[PDB]
Symmetry: D2
Amino acid sequence: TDQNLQACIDACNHCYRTCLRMAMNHCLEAGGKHVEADHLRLMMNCAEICQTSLNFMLSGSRFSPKVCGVCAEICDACAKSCEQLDGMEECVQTCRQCAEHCRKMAALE
Amino acid sequence: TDQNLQACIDACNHCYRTCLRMAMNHCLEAGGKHVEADHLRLMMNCAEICQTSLNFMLSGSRFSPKVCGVCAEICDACAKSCEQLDGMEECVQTCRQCAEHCRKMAALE
Amino acid sequence: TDQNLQACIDACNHCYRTCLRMAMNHCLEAGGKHVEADHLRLMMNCAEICQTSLNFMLSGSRFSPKVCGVCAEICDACAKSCEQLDGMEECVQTCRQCAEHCRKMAALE
Amino acid sequence: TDQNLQACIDACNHCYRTCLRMAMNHCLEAGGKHVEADHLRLMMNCAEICQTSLNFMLSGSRFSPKVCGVCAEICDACAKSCEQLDGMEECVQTCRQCAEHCRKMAALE
């Protein structure tokens, strides 16, 4: 548990940083499909939910599993959205990893 | 939808403000059971999740229903925790209302 | 103080909701200049700082004045950015009001 | 700049995680002076401001210097508050480091 918890914390933290950074930088400066309504919203949503999951686990919440389950779903969708664009390889990777760790946390409940 | 969406937004916003305010003020200044580990964490968790739900709906996320479902669960638990303490009547009320609106949003998915 | 504090809280809360909503909806769906790098970042930054100011005041922080001073600066810049675009009248208005209340809070320190 | 920016980002991220974790865990489970109104508020305020600074820099905001200046002030105060309690050595350390990097960012403006 000590290991899994810390592994999901770092994953959510990494994915949150990556989604926010790329959306507010790479995507905004590339325009076109990178700034399409559904994609950008998802990008920000993903950063938001990951940050929430991170905070719940940092605070020792007993509701982390539930929050993580939702986070995994949003991460998977964000990863698929990023598959369409280029230079977004780093985002696809982090969103898949985070989703996997979050699913493991959700399976605890 | 226009009405329900706005109703749940105001409910989450109100409950988020109330939970944060009371936890960081009333509860901290009362000590005793008001600052018990499980209660305070829940209080902050509830404020966090409500703020997340609020942000998802404000941003027009298609994942609001899912997030709201989790928010309703945390709100119900926070409401029960506040039933134990005194001067917490306002928190019980707002947590119940928010949970109800969030359940309505979750039922959309 | 009781009045001023509550007035700045509602102003920050209103401006935060407005900036997030319009950026993630109106601006993203309008494209063009509405999604220009500097403008959108500012929009999100403004929503972020207002949310932080709101949280500091809700929590009874003694550092609210300082945070509010920074919030006023960002709100003024966001208001000017929105003056360029159309349909953004509501954002200009809320950013100016919030900036004024925040300046009043900052003047307390 | 590339180095300094990344150094302050990791510092704020580390300090934010540490303040939230310790406040919601160690301090809440220790009670006594660890849960004193002013100390806990500061702890949460510090986590909040650091998270805001982190987000501003991640998003490439031109207002990071200003936000960081405020963050450094709150970090210094939180570090002094933690000097009073025991087992809080890790928090004192991270709050001092973050404050130093934030001061460097603020000096850019």
